[PDB]
Amino acid sequence: TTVRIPAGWPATEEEARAVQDELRGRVILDEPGPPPGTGRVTGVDVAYDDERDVVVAAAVVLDAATLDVVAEATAVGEVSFPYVPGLLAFREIPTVLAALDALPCPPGLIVCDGYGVAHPRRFGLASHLGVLTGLPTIGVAKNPFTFSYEDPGAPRGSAAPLLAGADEVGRALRTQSGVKPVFVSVGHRVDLDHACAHTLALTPKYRIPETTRRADSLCRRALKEATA
Amino acid sequence: TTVRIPAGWPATEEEARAVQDELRGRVILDEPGPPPGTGRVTGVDVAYDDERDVVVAAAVVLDAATLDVVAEATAVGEVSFPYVPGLLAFREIPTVLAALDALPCPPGLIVCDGYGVAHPRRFGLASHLGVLTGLPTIGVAKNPFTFSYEDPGAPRGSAAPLLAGADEVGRALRTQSGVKPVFVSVGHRVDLDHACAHTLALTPKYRIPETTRRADSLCRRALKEATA
Ligand SMILES: OCCC(CCO)C(CO)(CO)CO
Ligand SMILES: [Cl-]
Ligand SMILES: [Mg+2]
Ligand SMILES: [Mg+2]
Ligand SMILES: [Mg+2]
Ligand SMILES: [Mg+2]
């Protein structure tokens, strides 16, 4: 049941960049998005195997109000693109879509362990996934990549602009008091204020969103099982 | 264990105002809030000791329809900020959050015995807790602070604008006929009409909302036990 490379999927960097520039026009930035603490919120993450050209994706759906897990699914796929910085999403999108499709319920708001508009072409994983699914998505990353930012306030909740050159592409958000911030960016159909609100609601106990913690653990386990 | 002052909690009035000026912009005013009589509603209140620099917070969750108590939690903490009018919330927020975190269920709607937008800087306890938790909140106060208002009608349910200069920051609400009014203000993710509707729902017999009566009694008992 391995997810194969989609028929006609980009095979060159020129084609991939062309897809990004074309699909970016479908991104919605002025829709505030759903509020935190209600409905469903889903984490997505992937694990790449080092021995075979396979990638495993996991989607974990949480009840936003309680943060309890209500559903989960994984998918195994063929890596669909060579390793090229700036086009990394082309390696895993097909498999991520498969994991989401395997869920027994809608994901609600999708939280990716990565970036959305905070990308060289303003079309990272979260934005790419958002436009293809038509669903609200955001990205929360552990490191700032090559972006810059002023240290946000020390208290949890504090934020600061995350910049690509001089342009704001997200926010450094303090999820835990006095602890290193995470980097939040909009993906699709969610604004920055709401992206931050969801990230804080997913981090009452840890620095990393529970959606990422859950999805990370699950795809790693599924990858181990797939290679066994 | 005693809730200590957060790793990066404000230490100066300048830092405190910085937090307020940053989070105030994230307060939500265009949402109606949960329908009264549905789900759960939570009261929060604190008790300060005169001899020891400690504050005790209590969170009591009620069934919105019946007003029956369904959950309770308390927390004892170090006063996290010196006494400075306009920044009083910085002394108790960490402890209040600890109490909320210890609850076995989502709060639903947080009703504070204090103020929300009706604050000398438009960011009182209710609004601050709202932005930090992402939850809907309102403030219900026993006195009008320094705000002006005309006596509301005599019958229960009667209301009148609570003004800060010329701007409405809440409403003087008659919760009981022949009894002085209380002062309701939006905290976060709730509108004034709903804040008042919830306040009337919480006052079928007494002047003070049952959420406050419950939380007040609980933090007071917890404080006595803590300093015993
Ligand atoms: O509902 C699960 C999370 C809650 C903790 C229990 O009320 C929380 C309370 O403010 C949010 O509703 C965050 O600690
Ligand atoms: Cl990329
Ligand atoms: Mg990962
Ligand atoms: Mg991972
Ligand atoms: Mg009180
Ligand atoms: Mg009291």
Tab-separated table of N, CA, C and O in Angstrom, chain A residues 35-36 65-66 154-159 177-178 193 200, chain B residues 6-8 10 19 22-23 25-26 106 131-132 134 189:
chain	number	residue	atom	x	y	z
A	35	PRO	N	-11.066	29.417	15.950
A	35	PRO	CA	-10.499	29.780	17.248
A	35	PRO	C	-9.869	28.569	17.924
A	35	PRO	O	-10.166	27.423	17.584
A	36	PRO	N	-8.966	28.806	18.880
A	36	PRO	CA	-8.342	27.674	19.561
A	36	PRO	C	-9.299	27.109	20.608
A	36	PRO	O	-10.289	27.749	20.963
A	65	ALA	N	-10.157	21.232	22.588
A	65	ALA	CA	-10.490	21.664	23.938
A	65	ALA	C	-9.716	20.935	25.037
A	65	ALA	O	-9.273	21.553	26.003
A	66	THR	N	-9.553	19.626	24.881
A	66	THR	CA	-8.874	18.805	25.880
A	66	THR	C	-7.455	18.382	25.508
A	66	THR	O	-6.651	18.040	26.378
A	154	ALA	N	10.294	37.838	27.448
A	154	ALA	CA	10.568	36.608	28.185
A	154	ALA	C	9.330	35.800	28.587
A	154	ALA	O	9.360	34.573	28.579
A	155	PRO	N	8.228	36.474	28.953
A	155	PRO	CA	7.035	35.713	29.345
A	155	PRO	C	6.385	34.918	28.220
A	155	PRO	O	6.426	35.321	27.059
A	156	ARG	N	5.789	33.785	28.580
A	156	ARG	CA	5.078	32.957	27.615
A	156	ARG	C	4.004	33.838	26.981
A	156	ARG	O	3.355	34.632	27.667
A	157	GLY	N	3.821	33.700	25.672
A	157	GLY	CA	2.833	34.505	24.974
A	157	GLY	C	3.477	35.621	24.167
A	157	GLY	O	2.894	36.122	23.202
A	158	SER	N	4.680	36.014	24.573
A	158	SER	CA	5.429	37.064	23.894
A	158	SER	C	5.806	36.631	22.479
A	158	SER	O	6.098	35.459	22.231
A	159	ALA	N	5.816	37.584	21.557
A	159	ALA	CA	6.161	37.293	20.180
A	159	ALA	C	7.029	38.397	19.598
A	159	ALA	O	7.169	39.479	20.177
A	177	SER	N	7.922	30.096	29.311
A	177	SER	CA	8.607	31.169	30.016
A	177	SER	C	10.115	30.993	30.104
A	177	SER	O	10.604	29.965	30.572
A	178	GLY	N	10.839	32.011	29.647
A	178	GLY	CA	12.291	31.992	29.688
A	178	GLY	C	12.969	30.933	28.839
A	178	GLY	O	14.190	30.788	28.889
A	193	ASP	N	-2.205	36.071	14.152
A	193	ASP	CA	-2.721	36.112	15.512
A	193	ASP	C	-3.330	34.761	15.876
A	193	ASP	O	-3.088	34.240	16.965
A	200	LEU	N	-0.039	28.530	21.161
A	200	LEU	CA	-0.021	28.657	22.623
A	200	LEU	C	-0.965	27.631	23.247
A	200	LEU	O	-0.634	27.003	24.252
B	6	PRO	N	7.507	32.943	37.388
B	6	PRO	CA	7.993	32.449	36.093
B	6	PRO	C	9.428	32.861	35.771
B	6	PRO	O	9.864	33.956	36.123
B	7	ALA	N	10.143	31.976	35.081
B	7	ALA	CA	11.532	32.205	34.694
B	7	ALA	C	11.791	33.582	34.091
B	7	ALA	O	12.820	34.194	34.362
B	8	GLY	N	10.872	34.067	33.264
B	8	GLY	CA	11.063	35.373	32.658
B	8	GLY	C	9.913	36.329	32.915
B	8	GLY	O	9.501	37.075	32.026
B	10	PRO	N	7.899	39.597	34.291
B	10	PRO	CA	8.261	41.009	34.432
B	10	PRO	C	8.746	41.346	35.836
B	10	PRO	O	8.187	40.880	36.832
B	19	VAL	N	4.399	44.098	28.217
B	19	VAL	CA	3.580	42.905	28.037
B	19	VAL	C	2.146	43.321	27.731
B	19	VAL	O	1.516	42.789	26.815
B	22	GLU	N	1.700	44.764	24.282
B	22	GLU	CA	1.863	43.780	23.227
B	22	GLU	C	0.663	42.849	23.119
B	22	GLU	O	0.167	42.593	22.021
B	23	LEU	N	0.201	42.340	24.257
B	23	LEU	CA	-0.927	41.414	24.270
B	23	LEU	C	-2.291	42.071	24.073
B	23	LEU	O	-3.229	41.428	23.599
B	25	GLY	N	-3.293	44.027	21.895
B	25	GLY	CA	-3.691	44.010	20.495
B	25	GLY	C	-4.234	42.674	20.036
B	25	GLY	O	-4.823	42.565	18.960
B	26	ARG	N	-4.043	41.649	20.858
B	26	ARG	CA	-4.520	40.317	20.520
B	26	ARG	C	-5.840	39.968	21.208
B	26	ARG	O	-6.342	38.848	21.097
B	106	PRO	N	-12.056	21.272	30.396
B	106	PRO	CA	-11.876	22.620	29.838
B	106	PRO	C	-12.758	23.598	30.617
B	106	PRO	O	-13.880	23.258	30.991
B	131	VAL	N	-6.025	36.215	26.634
B	131	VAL	CA	-4.991	36.087	25.618
B	131	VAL	C	-4.005	34.967	25.938
B	131	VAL	O	-3.562	34.250	25.040
B	132	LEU	N	-3.658	34.797	27.210
B	132	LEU	CA	-2.715	33.745	27.569
B	132	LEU	C	-3.253	32.323	27.428
B	132	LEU	O	-2.495	31.407	27.128
B	134	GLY	N	-6.282	31.690	25.576
B	134	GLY	CA	-7.050	31.612	24.346
B	134	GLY	C	-8.525	31.381	24.615
B	134	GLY	O	-9.317	31.302	23.682
B	189	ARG	N	-12.862	37.345	23.589
B	189	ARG	CA	-13.714	36.443	22.822
B	189	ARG	C	-15.176	36.365	23.257
B	189	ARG	O	-15.831	35.334	23.090
